[PDB]
Amino acid sequence: FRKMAFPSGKVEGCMVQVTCGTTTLNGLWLDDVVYCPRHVICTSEDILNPNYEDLLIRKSNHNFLVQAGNVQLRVIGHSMQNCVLKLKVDTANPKTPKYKFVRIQPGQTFSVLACYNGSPSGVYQCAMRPNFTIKGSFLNGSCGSVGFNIDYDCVSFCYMHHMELPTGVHAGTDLEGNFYGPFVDRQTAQAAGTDTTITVNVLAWLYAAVINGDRWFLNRFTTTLNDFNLVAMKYNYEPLTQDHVDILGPLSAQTGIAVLDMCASLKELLQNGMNGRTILGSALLEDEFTPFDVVRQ
Amino acid sequence: FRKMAFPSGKVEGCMVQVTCGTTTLNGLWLDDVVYCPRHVICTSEDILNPNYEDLLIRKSNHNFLVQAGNVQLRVIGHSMQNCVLKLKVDTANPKTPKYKFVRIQPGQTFSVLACYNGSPSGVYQCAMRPNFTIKGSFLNGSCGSVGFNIDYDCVSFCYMHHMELPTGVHAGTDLEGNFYGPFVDRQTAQAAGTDTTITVNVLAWLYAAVINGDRWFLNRFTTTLNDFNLVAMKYNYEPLTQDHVDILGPLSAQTGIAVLDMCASLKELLQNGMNGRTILGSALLEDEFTPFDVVRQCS
């Protein structure tokens, strides 16, 4: 098993650059709107304690340079929605895919198309941590890069990039401009909450192991969901939600192992360790493969 | 620092489906030619002991069904080049990028676009192992998926997929149809040569750990090139050449850590183990990042 991104072409065709003054970030061109982080309007002085409403009042359509490559798209309207700027342009993007904007939950994975000056640089899989950071790979100029999933040719955009925390993890918004986590878009050192292990994904990984014949950890016990959740928190594992139990349904059906029986198996691994033994050739439990990722592979 | 693939759009616009009889796999459509594994012409009976020139002379142009999405492209000619079939079609692909065919060296990396029925499914980074396998993720119907690098809008195709070995690793050809490694496109269980670890890549990745503010594995010691290579070979690592030392120069320059000092670090890691510590979250030494991979990502 390995981290596999979605093919990025449908998103590549939507990447543009947005410049105010000498500040350029990436934007997302869908139909006749370009979406980008609102702090493109900020100067070096501004980003410390920006008054975005006052800053945007000073801006006009003709202050925004939107380019597809070196081709300018004329801006005909602007508005701010939370931490994203929406620039109406006079050309509908002919490469616009079928798309949705979605807000994901911790544990869900998505592909990131890392971009610089509107030019795609690389693609990789990320998981949203329970503390609402992602372990990305982003340099200066990456803001406005997006994260996405693809289902039957419809692109669900779920992330736009804004920030690198002092710990080296990354933070951003959904495409309505609402941050994941407690972060704010200003030039300040911000800390995330303590992270936890994504239980539902560890369970998906154990199902993957069973599918491949690696099942020594299957035990004779079961547990209630409440009992499991109280134990999990003692080992810095996320509690399971009802939605977690149901997204494990297909893997539970495929293997014949009830979700709560797998929970009892995981509980024993937490309370006793793995005793040098491996699962899928690894000494560590993996928590960045979702149930869909296991099935998608 | 992450395993990062190249954006796959330029390649997606080239993937098509090729069908002969009941056999279907993927092909690569560049200008007016579709490239695909030659065993698309084989039935379940043919693949055990295929005489490819004999099987191909018995096929006509109209035996090949090439589909680009919902659109069928007419095959107007065909030729075989080693293990690759070249179908001339009457339509040129307007999405054809600037491209080259290259044969990569062991230790080099590339992006794979995994495809099924001519439709792209996923993209990920692979390295050509020293034993000329790749550790991929490929299922039934993935044959003809390609691997590639991109450099300034030019796509260098280096890999076309053909086989999964009993061990679960993967084997294929360059775009001239020549296998990497001692493998053959027949339906047989095939073993690879003993694999080894790509030493220059492990060192590049230890540098990546340092560029990302992690230094726990460094030490105050140094080594000669030959003394390092003696220990490396003992642990089934590939020899480090002076070319590799030079190639690592930019990373040593950026971090201020001499290459042979990093070799002394790796020697200690090999002789003492990682002791349950992790480097960039990995519990094992990673050898699928080239020095270029590290530099292109960290800067």
Ligand SMILES: COc1cccc2[nH]c(C(=O)N[C@@H](CC(C)C)C(=O)N[C@@H](C[C@@H]3CCNC3=O)C(=O)c3nc4ccccc4s3)cc12
């Ligand atoms: C004392 O301040 C700190 C102390 C400790 C850690 C810190 N982190 C950040 C922080 O992240 N700032 C934001 C910017 C803020 C406004 C959201 C930022 O995102 N820069 C990048 C992505 C970064 C860069 C490196 N790789 C990361 O992904 C981005 O693309 C943007 N660049 C600009 C440049 C000009 C104007 C707008 C933008 S938006 C500040 C900071």
Ligand SMILES: COc1cccc2[nH]c(C(=O)N[C@@H](CC(C)C)C(=O)N[C@@H](C[C@@H]3CCNC3=O)C(=O)c3nc4ccccc4s3)cc12
């Ligand atoms: C006793 O035989 C074995 C014993 C022990 C391990 C083994 N492995 C293979 C083996 O790999 N065969 C080749 C095919 C050979 C002919 C090149 C093959 O099936 N390639 C796949 C990709 C495979 C499939 C699973 N995921 C992998 O990547 C591909 O797409 C193609 N399918 C067909 C189907 C029909 C006709 C042409 C093609 S070409 C055989 C084998």
